[PDB]
């Protein structure tokens, strides 16, 4: 019945989708664990760098200087990988929705407001007399084009200072 | 079966849609005709202004100033109307598509390119071992997560100037 | 089930393909290693040619003149071989894909846009009335040929200056 | 089994495809008929213009100028339509093939010629020792990487004018 | 007949609605039970904390100190969940009504009072002479605009201290 959805997720899409979001969330928590338990190794080193900064021991600071870099080299790729999954998990939750009734109602009512703003504009009045005379008495669209009968075309305050300005 | 689309276009949407687009190009040509047949009234007036520009008759030029104003007031409301319909006819064609197979193929093939760019990032390769081990041998998604298995990573050129910089 | 794929890669194609891309990537890294470790022999010689250029020693420059050529003769074939594998590995990754669902969706949605641009052209309108009346209510193609009902054929602004130009 | 092709052509693609190509040659002949039967109205008019060219009657030639314009306005929209259908019928035949065995043999036998040109380049022979030692004795690919084993390389005529040129 | 109501609640809305309010009320009573039977475990602990507060037993209070926190941690999420369902059950009873005759009469009679307050304002009197002369003798609205004939426009006590204040 829907072939593009099965061309992406396979012969049973609804169990392929919950099979990624198991795996893509187990790895989403192992990053948040390995930044929780690796921040405290950064927090203890801030107590151990500040310890031997007042001790002024060369053999102590240069021994912490090796492990402070190798963990911050580990931190900068695990902090990156948290933003890597969140780019994947957001683009793949967008693929999972993609044709839902929830997005169909949310994107249509946001569009019917944008049509309702445009059908009341006065220069397309004479379209709406012709359009009301032709359409079926349908739902949203035909209920807008007959609700816009609140305008007639009449002359207003014209310019007189431009008539003598054309000869000028 | 199709409730949002019938709520917008009525109980038979496919004939409501071609009933608008029929009307909305009848007015699409009547604007384009009345910008064409009224430009040549502005074109003949540019000759008749240039006629009595050398005659230097105030009783001739200001008689054209009464009718040149009535055409350019008419032109600027009809030139506006061409932008009025084309704002409506573009939004009301977006409402006609809105859930089609034509949008389903277009908005998803451009979405699978964006996932193919993200699954190949080397920080999340450790996810793609676990993800390839779990998924059904599906279409697009499970064909991308094992087409990223044709690569492996290894350690590189570490910084040798970092330890003395950290103790600095 | 697919015989051309097995006529190229043998009785088990999926393990022939990952057996090349092991070998064709080990050699892809031995070139990048042997241009990394041979550039530094070119970089030290730029310190040793510039050394004895100010020393003005004939017996030093003409001894570096032998090894500068034999390494640049080595460099120019190893730099070539990097572009040799990348021509092979790109033509053989194209053979590995060649019938994938990923290329099937990417090359079809790029083609359905090219059909959508052509079916709306006005001279083939009277085809599309006949074509809509005949086709099944299918997916992408039949959803395009009934969406193009937004045009009727009517006369426009004809030429009058060519009628008296035929006698001219 | 075939999801992209059924998404384009519907649940039975093979009868949707011959249902378009049936319609799209019915109009393929009606354009070719109406360019043939309308050329002879242009052909008889070239005699009747040449009739009253020597009669020198303005009341005869300009009566043909009213009907010669109505045929060449009709001819130029029907001559355009022959290029309109042939742009559609070529693209919609490309959509019908798009994944066939006929394209799989044609696009791959032309691809194996291009790999056969690249595996015989002598800079990458050192890959083809390691590649022949690893691959299964397959079809086309492993038959090319050992049909390039009927050759060997050796050092050639070195430059004797390079050392003095480098010290120059 | 009503498509938005079926797009939300499905093909039979009236049995989807009483299928939530079964489930959403069973859970509404299991919270009120599990705060009724968990308050008495808080009430007995207030008799057991106040028991060993005068006994001054360290091994008794610190043993009740473990279970007093684990139940108040249980209480603070079950007290929250009572306010969680009542936010859901009130927003989903608002969805169930949403177009009823009961809300149609209650929101219209509250609106007709607001129109009745505004049509009697004296500056829009001259509208109501024109409006009474045009409308059909309808229900509520036309019965208000002819009931407002109890006013005529006449001059009152004008200011004289502002005439000499303009020159001032």
Numbering used by the authors:
A (entry chain A), B (entry chain B), C (entry chain A), D (entry chain B), E (entry chain A): 1 to 168
Paper lines:
Here, we present the 3.2-Å resolution cryo-EM structure of an extended Vps24 conformation organized in a double-stranded helical filament. Using the class averages and a real-space approach, we determined the helical symmetry and found that 11.09 units per turn make up a pitch of 279 Å. The determined Vps24 structure in the filament corresponds to an elongated conformation extending to 100 Å in length. Each extended Vps24 monomer packs against another Vps24 molecule to form a domain-swapped dimer. In this domain-swapped dimer, the helical repeating unit contains two Vps24 molecules that are distanced apart by 25.2 Å in translation and 32.5° by a left-handed rotation along the helical axis, making up a single protofilament. Within the studied Vps24 filaments, the extended Vps24 conformation forms a domain-swapped dimer that makes up the basic unit of two distinct protofilaments. The tightly integrated Vps24 molecule shares buried interaction surfaces with three neighboring Vps24 molecules inside a single strand of the assembly. The N-terminal helix α0 including positive K5 and K6 points into the core of the filament. In our cryo-EM structure, we find that helix α5 binds to the hairpin formed by helix α1′/α2′ of the corresponding domain-swapped dimer. The interactions between two protofilaments are scarce (N12, K133) and give rise to solvent-accessible cavities up to 10-Å distance between the molecules from the neighboring strands.
